[PDB]
């Protein structure tokens, strides 16, 4: 019974933290971490970095 | 508040269910589901399977 997205993300981040702490090098740690990065407006940041890199239009 | 592994796996599964339902077939749903699948794989299995040639 997870009610909203904000709470789902917090909980995803807590799970990633746990597995990082107890099984740092596992698949489950790696995937949970990548899931967490995909939960957090990641196309915005990426585009910004692509543009910064081109330097111009 | 995460106090044992079984509980981390349950939270992980519930997160997978939430993103599956709300943002089906998004990167987050896929990765969280896949993490939930691989959470039950023991060390003696994944240590070889990750680098199977």
Numbering used by the authors:
A (entry chain A): 302 to 358
B (entry chain B): 302 to 354
The article reads:
Contractile bacteriophages of the family Myoviridae (i.e. T4), R-type pyocins and the type VI secretion system (T6SS) of Gram-negative bacteria are evolutionarily related nano-scale injection machines that puncture target cell membranes using a shared contraction mechanism. TssA subunits are enigmatic as they possess a conserved N-terminal region of unknown function, previously identified as ImpA_N (PFAM: PF0681226), whereas sequences located C-terminal to this region are highly divergent.
Nested deletion of consecutive helical segments of TssA1B CTD revealed that loss of α15 resulted in the failure of the protein to assemble into a high molecular weight ring, and structure determination of the construct H12–H14 (helices α12–α14) and of that consisting of α12 and α13 alone (residues 303–347), revealed them both to be dimers. In the assembled Bc TssA1B CTD ring, analysis by PISA32 revealed an extensive dimer interface (~950 Å2) between monomers in the different layers, which principally involves the interaction of residues located in helices α12–α13 with their two-fold related subunits forming a region of hydrophobic packing with hydrophilic interactions at the periphery.
